[PDB]
Amino acid sequence: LFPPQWICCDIRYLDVSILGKFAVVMADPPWDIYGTLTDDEMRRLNIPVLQDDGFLFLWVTGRAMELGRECLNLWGYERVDEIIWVKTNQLQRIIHWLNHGKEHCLVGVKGNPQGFNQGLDCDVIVAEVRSTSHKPDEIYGMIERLSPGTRKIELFGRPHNVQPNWITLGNQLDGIHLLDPDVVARFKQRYPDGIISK
Amino acid sequence: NDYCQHFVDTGHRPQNFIRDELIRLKDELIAKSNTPPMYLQADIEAFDIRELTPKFDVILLEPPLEEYYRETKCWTWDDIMKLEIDEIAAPRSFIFLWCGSGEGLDLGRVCLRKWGYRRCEDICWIKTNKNNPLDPKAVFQRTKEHCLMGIKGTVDIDLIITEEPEIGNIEKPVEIFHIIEHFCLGRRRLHLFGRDSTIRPGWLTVGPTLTNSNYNAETYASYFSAPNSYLTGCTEEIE
Ligand SMILES: CNC(=O)[C@H]1O[C@@H](n2cnc3c(N)ncnc32)[C@H](O)[C@@H]1O
């Protein structure tokens, strides 16, 4: 069901098997480099159940450049691309050893994806920095052009992140908004009284 | 505007639309303190890197990856990983490793860790195509290269933006030298796989295509004997 959907939860404790398979997974995790996830919690996230064939988009910073690569390989992906978002102001000017003009998004592949439009976009994004920890909206169009009409899931998203074709998970979303009947059914089967604790 | 959509419509890469206190005396102190340029032709695969002394404060490593020759001896990451870089690095020293845009971004991190460094910066060379608006694993068009900065032991930004060089040109932007030199990391600077075209004051350049050599280990070491052994490369010369 194409319109936006979301689930306020602790992604650690949600049983994501009820959600199905996705052509694309994107995550902007709270790495431990606020409300944080330890390296072991990040490693233990049940990313593998979410896809059979498709792409993972994994935002990284600092030493998560290395840790995110570990997670990505542990979860069964091969990093095949790395998107760079160059942060500008409203005038298209760029905002320890070096100042940081960019943020990195690792791109991983799992299985044998078929029918994606690889090569439409290039691997650099130039876009206004808005709210803090807020990634740019251009990534959704790049992802839509790469895999049009497929179902997608975002981890650690926030209200502004909800998009058509996307199911958003995060603990700062508002309640539970689900419309795909298969999801609704498996959710009610697994959570008949609508609580998620362990 | 959405420059990603714009790139799919017109072919103009998003970076095409980036618009580019002195800090000059620093450059002058760097130039005063710079050793004369030194260079050696050496086939690095067959060459015992230990002959390169003394141990270096900065190593810039630019192995020629196959992916640099799309439309055209290349080094695999297998070959590079087997270089004994830790044998010539000073216990506190820095590395800058050009990794391309493919598997080098993973394998070059393995190299850094193998040689004893931790990555502290990821410098991106973003290439514009204002004058001209393909790995099978690739999901996106690759328009940049990465230079990893490693540290071992106890002003600028992490982006270089220039126009995409013409086909067959493998030169990296000379701006990487300015970034490295502005860190004031020490004066023993080695460039492995440099070329005649990259020789530069303050650097020892070593690579297989150099047509001339002037390197002498004793002469080179004399540039750093007391009282000049711990200069940053950004201080006044010692009288
Ligand atoms: C950089 N973006 C973020 O950090 C977003 O991730 C959220 N978040 C943090 N921990 C968890 C968690 N265990 N389960 C679900 N969501 C979480 C933040 O509250 C924030 O909304």
Side-chain angles (χ1 to χ4, degrees), chain A residues 3-33 35-89 92 94 97-130 134-187 190-194, chain B residues 2-18 20 26-27 29-31 33-48 50-65 67-69 72 74-91 93-133 135-136 138-153 156-166 168-217 219-235 238:
Chain A
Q5 307 171 79
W6 58 89
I7 307 188
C8 173
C9 50
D10 197 304
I11 292 161
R12 283 176 299 177
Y13 309 141
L14 174 73
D15 166 26
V16 290
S17 64
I18 76 180
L19 297 181
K21 309 307 185 165
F22 300 80
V24 185
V25 172
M26 178 163 76
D28 185 7
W31 305 105
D32 183 72
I33 59 199
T36 321
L37 264 64
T38 75
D39 300 7
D40 277 345
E41 299 179 308
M42 286 304 308
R43 275 187 275 257
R44 277 197 303 264
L45 292 177
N46 192 10
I47 300 316
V49 74
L50 290 177
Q51 302 193 278
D52 296 321
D53 298 85
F55 297 100
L56 161 72
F57 292 74
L58 189 59
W59 290 93
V60 302
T61 298
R63 70 165 192 100
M65 289 196 194
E66 283 74 38
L67 179 55
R69 282 183 160 76
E70 179 167 325
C71 286
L72 181 148
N73 289 327
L74 304 177
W75 300 333
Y77 293 79
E78 192 197 347
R79 197 208 46 80
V80 290
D81 259 324
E82 178 160 346
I83 295 183
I84 291 307
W85 163 34
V86 184
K87 295 146 127 184
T88 69
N89 55 24
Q92 306 322 290
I94 298 175
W97 298 90
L98 225 36
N99 296 344
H100 290 162
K102 48 165 173 62
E103 270 188 55
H104 299 234
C105 184
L106 313 181
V107 185
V109 66
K110 188 183 153 184
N112 303 305
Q114 303 188 48
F116 295 64
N117 310 303
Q118 282 154 79
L120 298 187
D121 280 80
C122 74
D123 55 2
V124 170
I125 292 164
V126 177
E128 272 223 83
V129 47
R130 278 131 47 207
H134 197 180
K135 301 316 179 266
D137 287 356
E138 284 85 341
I139 189 81
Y140 299 105
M142 296 166 68
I143 288 183
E144 202 53 29
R145 291 186 284 282
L146 166 69
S147 194
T150 57
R151 52 200 310 264
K152 303 164 180 78
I153 187 175
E154 183 171 348
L155 305 201
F156 308 103
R158 306 201 288 97
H160 53 217
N161 291 135
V162 301
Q163 310 283 322
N165 293 325
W166 287 78
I167 294 174
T168 316
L169 316 180
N171 66 5
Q172 265 166 357
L173 307 157
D174 208 0
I176 300 206
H177 185 44
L178 297 173
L179 300 165
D180 186 338
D182 295 1
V183 181
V184 166
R186 298 197 290 263
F187 182 94
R190 170 77 175 81
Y191 303 108
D193 272 270
Chain B
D2 181 351
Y3 293 113
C4 312
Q5 176 73 52
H6 190 243
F7 164 80
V8 316
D9 292 332
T10 71
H12 286 252
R13 303 167 176 181
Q15 52 265 41
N16 289 6
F17 305 93
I18 315 180
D20 264 294
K26 193 166 166 114
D27 265 349
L29 292 171
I30 289 157
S33 98
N34 273 342
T35 58
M38 273 193 32
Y39 40 92
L40 175 75
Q41 188 280 344
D43 282 282
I44 297 165
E45 69 278 56
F47 170 81
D48 180 49
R50 276 149 291 261
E51 291 171 56
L52 293 184
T53 51
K55 283 146 172 31
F56 297 93
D57 306 294
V58 177
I59 298 175
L60 169 66
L61 175 48
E62 198 186 308
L65 316 171
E67 77 195 64
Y68 299 165
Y69 311 97
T72 324
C74 312
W75 282 56
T76 68
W77 281 99
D78 208 308
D79 299 318
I80 297 156
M81 218 188 297
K82 300 176 170 171
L83 296 172
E84 309 209 337
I85 294 303
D86 47 292
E87 298 296 339
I88 62 172
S93 77
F94 296 78
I95 184 153
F96 296 81
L97 167 68
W98 281 108
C99 296
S101 38
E103 59 179 2
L105 278 44
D106 310 303
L107 293 172
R109 287 178 150 89
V110 174
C111 289
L112 257 56
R113 287 185 304 258
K114 189 195 174 72
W115 301 326
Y117 308 85
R118 42 197 197 280
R119 175 201 63 73
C120 37
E121 302 294 338
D122 183 324
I123 303 160
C124 279
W125 172 26
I126 286 169
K127 303 176 196 148
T128 64
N129 71 341
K130 302 181 206 181
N131 300 320
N132 264 308
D135 192 319
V139 184
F140 301 98
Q141 274 187 60
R142 293 183 178 165
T143 70
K144 42 147 186 86
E145 301 182 24
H146 293 255
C147 184
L148 303 181
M149 172 188 175
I151 183 175
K152 88 194 301 219
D156 277 294
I157 199 190
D158 60 351
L159 302 168
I160 307 171
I161 307 166
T162 77
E163 180 81 8
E164 174 114 16
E166 72 280 15
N169 186 317
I170 61 84
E171 312 288 305
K172 307 304 169 200
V174 67
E175 287 79 348
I176 189 67
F177 287 98
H178 308 168
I179 289 162
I180 294 161
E181 288 160 355
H182 294 161
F183 288 137
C184 309
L185 302 177
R187 303 170 63 239
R188 298 176 203 67
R189 317 201 192 91
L190 164 66
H191 185 189
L192 287 158
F193 298 102
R195 301 172 298 282
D196 280 3
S197 84
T198 66
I199 290 162
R200 183 173 171 95
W203 286 80
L204 166 58
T205 304
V206 175
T209 67
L210 300 209
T211 62
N212 279 260
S213 296
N214 71 339
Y215 173 74
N216 179 287
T219 309
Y220 189 63
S222 75
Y223 301 142
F224 310 107
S225 55
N228 296 325
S229 301
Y230 310 108
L231 291 193
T232 60
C234 292
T235 41
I238 299 294

